[PDB]
Design a binder for these strands. Structure first.
Length: 187
DNA sequence: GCTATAAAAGGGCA
DNA sequence: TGCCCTTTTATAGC
């Protein structure tokens, strides 16, 4: 790892990317669910056609408005690439589908600092950013202000970082928390 | 399973 | 007017 961009020497692994795009045309969801083999639509439950492709492994929520949500990709490039594949399937179904305002909405990453954490203590010292009700959920919820990112910290040293729109925020949030985790290493 | 976290889309309903 | 709901993903105890 490049110790220069990642001083901790640990790089969060990207696990999930959520993006949206505007197909810029009205869609008939019922016609889509009927023609598209790997598409499901239950309006009484959710007003979107749920469609999935194997590569990049992702799930799309396609709306009558032409707007679309792409989930599951492991990278921003994979997410865009997936979003484009769905837009082409919709095109080939007979709709004038474009690709307007593609935007990465959320990036989820995770890593392991490989040492256990004293969550109770970190929670106490960082109360204005922490929520820890172990009887509820075993992880401590750390709502970082700069960058405005949320981290789920576990006793095992495993960390989840979410809420970023740019991978650098994921990286910086982790670099910010790293000395703090060290400060609260369980001995 | 399911507790919790982020985020987007849009229909239903209080 | 504005929350829930659906989907995804890592994490870990119920």
């Amino acid at each position: 790892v490049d110790l220069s961009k990642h001083p901790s020497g640990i790089v969060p692994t990207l696990q999930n990317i959520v993006s949206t795009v505007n197909l810029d045309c009205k869609l008939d969801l019922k016609a889509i669910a009927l023609q598209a083999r790997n598409a499901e639509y239950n309006p009484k439950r959710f007003a979107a056609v749920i469609m999935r492709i194997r590569e990049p492994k992702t799930t799309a929520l396609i709306f009558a408005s032409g707007k679309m949500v792409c989930t599951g990709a492991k990278s921003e490039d994979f997410s865009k690439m997936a979003a484009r594949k769905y837009a082409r399937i919709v095109q080939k179904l007979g709709f004038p589908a474009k690709f307007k305002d593609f935007k990465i909405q959320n990036i989820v990453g995770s890593c392991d600092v490989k040492f256990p954490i004293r969550l109770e203590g970190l929670a106490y010292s960082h109360a204005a950013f922490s929520s820890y009700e172990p009887e509820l959920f075993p992880g401590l919820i750390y709502r970082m202000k700069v960058p405005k990112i949320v981290l789920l910290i576990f006793v095992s040293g495993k960390i989840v970082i979410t809420g970023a729109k740019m991978r650098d925020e994921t990286y910086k949030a982790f670099e910010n928390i790293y000395p703090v985790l060290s400060e609260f290493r369980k001995i």
